[PDB]
């Protein structure tokens, strides 16, 4: 949920202001908890539910490498 | 401890204080004794992850002015063995890198290296305000590193005895993504280029200078994307000059180049996940005698 | 990793310090054992270091090299002479070849003495006694008297390294 | 028998004791054997030197202190021991991590070499389920256990070889010999699986319902006579005897009571003689088990009374009627039982009774040695 | 014994009870294992075996009993460990099935009165944890856990398990028969 709010506009209820310009590169995004989720998938894949969660974070992974690779663009292009 | 994600802990110029700047929004301080350590001080009062937190001097006094994210810095003073918020400045838009201080004549100003497009300066007498002064103007993008020189003027030059008084001018490098490298000098009041050199084919990632505690020789170490490692040595005598001799073909992105308290070692750690200690030995160039783990 | 007294690495992240013969399963005893039964049934899947611990790592370990280190200096601190320039005093050693000579004698009466020093010592002993034979006044001229010939010196030094080489 | 009244106080515990691979013999044994104790002073594998031999050593004669010649700590719990070739010394650890030394017979001295390791293996979380038995095959190794997992490797191995896992995954228990390359293996749910090293040939389709039950059972080993003849023993309370050579056949069934059937063992020369080490009582040699019936044994067992110092053979005269090994039907209970207690409140956990020479590591601090046993 | 009845009698309080279990699950004096550990390791049992069996004396065992009775008495076991474990019995009650009940009279022993001791200290303990379980309608159901993939075992309560292992084929009526007889 942090994420989609972050990703759409949602952040104001969490608190989190609009992000910092000129960052197209890496703002603040904790690695550790998508690692740590990496490792619990992989240790516990068993289900279905680990199949489904693990093919919902890919979309949003490949969804958020695709914006950050427009937004570096539109970066570098100035 | 070792469960957070430190960046580069600080130790007390005596040796028995360690400071940690973890990820717990907080700020550790143990007490090294005998063999274990001992937690006392729990500082609370950093937004964000701490980068790290610079001595200032033992003659002028006790203060270690932290710097986390949310854009702000907090400067802090020591009394009766505890510690207290005594100055917070905030108030920009793109993340802060990391803060230094000055060596022993030099002074005891404070540089907030910020990714504004801008360098921030604040400069600290002892007990009284904080001047902060802002030059704007510096390229495309922010800076990412910055240094400073010696106490004494820049070159490595033979004074006589009873025959050099160190001046308070300043001299600082800022490194940051534009392929370049430069050196600003200021006369109390009048930053002004030094040198330019076109030499980088790549995103300069950091450069450290190395104000060596006991020669005045002047030597900035850089690092890129690709790992060139130029050692930009001035060992002439009040001019400026720097050769660009390649230490090793890294690939690699190295983000920290530390300096020794004599600024005549080199701790490199970046992404190759070892830290070799290329000395300098007795004849020049380099020489790679220890490797650890990162 | 941290810093200190120039060549002193401290503790702060991963590095490979002192080595001790106490690893687990090894040869006369020596074994040891980490937290097994700490996650039981439900339990965090990350696995990271835990706590820390402040060490040293050092490069000598040797504690006979205190006399090799203290003996040079104090026949230094004869030859030193003080100079007294500016506020700290300048100290500059003054050229002569006697300092020489009983760097070469000390080394050999502490090798006569007890020749429980380093083969890279025993060396630089033999090296001063070279570099006396050579550059310094030799015994000949003591114990001969009137004579200033070139070719009596080269004999004589000639001889001198014959001897030094039948030492060795 | 020749049980005394001398017993020394000798604070070492036992769990197992392996020996030397005596070829061409099985009643006599060498004086130094390797004791894997539960804990001695910690969980470890010790040396130790005495004068254990066949048939009675001459010298020290009873109450034989040992002598201990190089300690080596084994990481975990020490459950089985079995040596491979001459010079091999394989532990199981409950750890996981199944210890193989290459040390030197003569000189006295382990020497620590290779681990196998991964013996728990789980998705999702994690189960601690190692193998318990071990057996050799020179120079083969299995290891079994209640998981279905089957472990073999070959001689100089440090990693894993063969890990046979099929759809029938049982959790075997003991292990046992045929011959020379058939091995049989009872399980911890009633079942017996058969196979050899050359084809691996599972059948554990062998369930009686009517006269034998199908506990779970536990120990099993071979008789002196006929090889192929072997005897288990587990919870169901009847040491069950079989007369395997290729297929499951039975025997002799002889109910047992008040007992648990931890440990059996046999001895040679006269094959008439089988002990049972259990959790369950206090000390009790049988005496007619597998055979059918030996007079002059009674007036004891348990913890009453004591008959040693005459081991009283059945008349052998002019018979009619055939007298062997026959002793089915598991209505019957303790027939002719030897009291090896010396009627004091003890806690015992090991006895090995390798020949005549018997030796009981118990939790009491206390050794026990017995040089004769069939006089 | 002598600090293992002090931290009972401390424990007699609620709080002061449940910080002692919630310090005792975090320091692991009987190793406990559910997952992983070593089974039978270095501890109480290893110190019970070794220096209670050369002293002929057992009343490390009684104290841990009657801490292990005050402290389940004064607060239940809600949650095992501190943040990085699971609440289980399991372990306890494995130890308990197997060492107590089996080797507590017939051992080596200088003075009659220790068996008995040690009987009526086990069996008022296990009277009081019987009396003070009590089995839910609950417990009938598949108790099978199925959170995002964690296929585990039939996690079943201890107290049901004491009460069909009492139920089915036990010891412990033959334990109590020769109590009687002792009696």
Redesign the interface.
């Given at each position: 949920e942090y994420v989609d709010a972050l990703l759409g506009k949602g952040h104001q209820y969490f608190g989190i202001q609009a992000p910092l310009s000129a960052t197209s590169q890496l703002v603040w995004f904790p690695y550790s908890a998508i690692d740590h989720l990496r490792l619990a998938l992989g240790e516990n894949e068993n289900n279905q539910h680990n199949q489904a969660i693990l093919g919902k974070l890919q979309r949003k992974m490949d969804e958020y490498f695709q914006k950050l690779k427009k937004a570096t663009d539109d970066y570098k292009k100035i | 401890s070792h469960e957070d994600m430190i960046h580069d802990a600080q130790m007390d110029y005596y040796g028995i204080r360690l400071a940690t700047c973890s990820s717990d929004r907080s700020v550790k301080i143990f007490d090294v004794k005998n063999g274990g350590q001992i937690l006392i001080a729990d500082l609370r009062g950093h937004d964000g992850p701490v980068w790290q937190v610079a001595w200032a001097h033992p003659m002028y006094g006790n203060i270690l002015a932290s710097c986390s994210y949310d854009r702000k810095v907090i400067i802090w003073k020591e009394e009766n063995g505890t510690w207290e918020k005594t100055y917070e400045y905030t108030g920009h838009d793109s993340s802060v890198n990391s803060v230094c201080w000055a060596p022993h004549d030099f002074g005891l100003v404070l540089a907030c290296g910020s990714s504004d497009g801008a360098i921030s300066i604040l400069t600290f007498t002892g007990d009284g305000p904080w001047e902060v002064k802002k030059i704007s103007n510096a390229h495309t993008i922010g800076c990412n590193a910055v240094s400073w020189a010696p106490s004494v003027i820049p070159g490595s030059l033979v004074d006589q005895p009873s025959s050099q008084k160190p001046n308070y001018i300043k001299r600082f490098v800022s490194g940051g993504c534009d392929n370049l490298v430069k050196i600003w000098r200021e006369e109390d009041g009048q930053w002004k280029e030094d040198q330019k050199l076109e030499a980088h084919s790549d995103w300069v990632r950091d450069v450290a200078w190395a104000p060596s505690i006991g020669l005045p020789t002047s030597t900035i170490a850089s690092c890129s994307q690709d790992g060139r490692v130029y050692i930009w040595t001035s060992d002439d005598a009040a001019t400026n000059c720097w050769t660009p001799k390649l230490l090793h073909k890294f690939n690699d992105v190295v983000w920290h180049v530390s300096w020794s308290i004599t600024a005549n070692i080199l701790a490199v750690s970046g992404g190759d996940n070892k830290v070799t200690l290329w000395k300098e030995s007795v004849d020049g160039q380099w020489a790679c005698i220890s490797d650890v783990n990162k | 990793?941290?810093?200190?007294?120039?060549?002193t690495?401290?503790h702060?992240?991963?590095?490979?310090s002192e080595r001790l013969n106490a690893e687990?399963?090894?040869?006369?005893?020596?074994?040891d054992?980490g937290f097994?039964?700490?996650?039981?049934?439900?339990?965090?899947?990350?696995?990271?270091?835990?706590?820390?611990?402040?060490e040293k790592?050092s490069?000598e370990q040797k504690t006979k090299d205190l006399q090799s280190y203290l003996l040079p200096l104090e026949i230094e601190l004869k030859n030193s002479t003080v100079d007294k320039?500016?506020?700290c005093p300048?100290f500059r050693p003054n050229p002569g070849v006697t300092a020489i000579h009983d760097y070469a004698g000390w080394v050999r009466n502490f090798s006569s003495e007890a020749a429980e020093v380093e083969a890279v010592v025993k060396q630089w002993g033999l090296t001063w006694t070279l570099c006396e034979s050579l550059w310094g006044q030799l015994k000949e001229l003591e114990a001969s008297l009137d004579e200033p010939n070139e070719y009596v010196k080269n004999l004589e030094r000639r001889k001198a390294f014959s001897h030094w080489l039948a030492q060795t | 028998m020749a049980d005394k009244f001398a017993a020394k106080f000798v604070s070492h515990k036992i769990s197992r004791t392996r020996w030397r691979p005596v070829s061409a013999s099985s009643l006599q044994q060498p004086d130094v054997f390797a004791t894997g104790s539960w804990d001695n002073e910690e969980n470890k594998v010790c040396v130790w030197a005495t004068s254990d031999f066949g048939a009675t050593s001459l010298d020290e004669e009873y109450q034989g202190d040992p002598k201990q010649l190089c300690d080596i700590k084994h990481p975990g719990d020490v459950m089985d021991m079995q040596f491979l070739d001459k010079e091999r010394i394989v532990t199981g650890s409950s750890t996981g991590t199944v210890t193989i030394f290459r040390h030197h017979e003569n000189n006295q001295t382990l020497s620590v070499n290779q681990r196998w390791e991964q013996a728990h293996y789980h998705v999702g979380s994690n189960m601690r389920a190692p193998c318990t038995a071990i057996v050799c095959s020179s120079p083969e190794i299995v290891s079994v256990g209640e998981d279905g997992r089957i472990n073999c490797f070959r001689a100089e191995s440090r990693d894993v070889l063969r890990t046979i896992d099929d759809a029938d995954s049982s959790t075997m228990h003991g292990v046992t010999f045929l011959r020379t390359t058939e091995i049989l293996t009872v399980n911890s749910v009633g079942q017996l699986k058969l196979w050899d090293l050359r084809k691996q040939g599972n059948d554990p389709t062998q369930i009686f319902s009517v006269t034998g039950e199908r506990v779970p059972l536990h120990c099993v080993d071979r008789h002196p006579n006929q090889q192929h003849v072997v005897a288990t023993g587990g919870q169901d309370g009847m040491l069950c005897i079989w007369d395997v050579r290729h297929g499951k056949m039975p025997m002799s069934l002889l109910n047992a009571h008040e007992a648990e059937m931890w440990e059996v063992h046999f001895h040679p020369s006269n094959p008439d003689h089988l002990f049972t080490c259990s959790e369950d009582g206090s000390l009790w040699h049988w005496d007619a088990s597998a055979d059918s019936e030996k007079p002059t044994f009674l007036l004891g067992g348990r913890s009453t009374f004591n008959i040693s110092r005459s081991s009283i053979a059945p008349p052998n005269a002019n018979q009619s009627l055939a007298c062997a090994w026959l002793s089915t039907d598991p209505t019957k209970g303790q027939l002719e039982i030897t009291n090896l207690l010396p009627s004091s409140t003890l806690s015992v956990n090991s006895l090995d009774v390798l020949g005549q020479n018997l030796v009981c590591g118990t939790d009491a601090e206390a050794i026990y040695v017995t040089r004769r046993l069939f006089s | 014994a002598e600090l293992l009845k002090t931290l009972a009698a401390f424990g007699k309080s609620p709080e002061i009870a449940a910080s002692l279990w919630q310090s005792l699950e975090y320091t692991q004096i009987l190793q406990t294992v559910r997952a992983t550990g070593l089974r039978q390791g270095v501890g109480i049992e290893v110190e019970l075996n070794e220096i209670e069996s050369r002293c002929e004396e057992y009343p490390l065992t009684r104290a841990f009993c009657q801490l292990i009775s005050t402290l389940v008495e004064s607060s239940f076991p809600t949650n095992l460990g501190a943040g990085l474990r699971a609440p289980g019995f399991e372990p306890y009650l494995q130890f308990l099935r197997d060492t107590v009940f089996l080797r507590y009279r017939t051992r080596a022993y200088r003075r009659a009165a220790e068996k008995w001791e040690v009987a009526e200290a086990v069996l008022d303990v296990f009277y009081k944890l019987l009396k003070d379980y009590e089995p839910q309608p609950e417990d009938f159901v598949d108790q099978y856990v199925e959170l995002q993939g964690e296929e585990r075992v039939a996690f079943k309560p201890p107290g049901f398990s004491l009460m069909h292992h009492l139920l089915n084929e036990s010891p412990m009526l033959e334990l109590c028969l020769s109590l009687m007889e002792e009696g």
């Open positions: - | - | 990793v941290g810093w200190g007294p120039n060549w690495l401290v702060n992240g991963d590095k490979l687990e399963d090894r040869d006369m005893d020596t074994i054992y097994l039964p700490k996650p039981t049934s439900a339990k965090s899947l990350t696995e990271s270091p835990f706590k820390v611990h402040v790592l490069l320039s500016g506020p300048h | - | -």
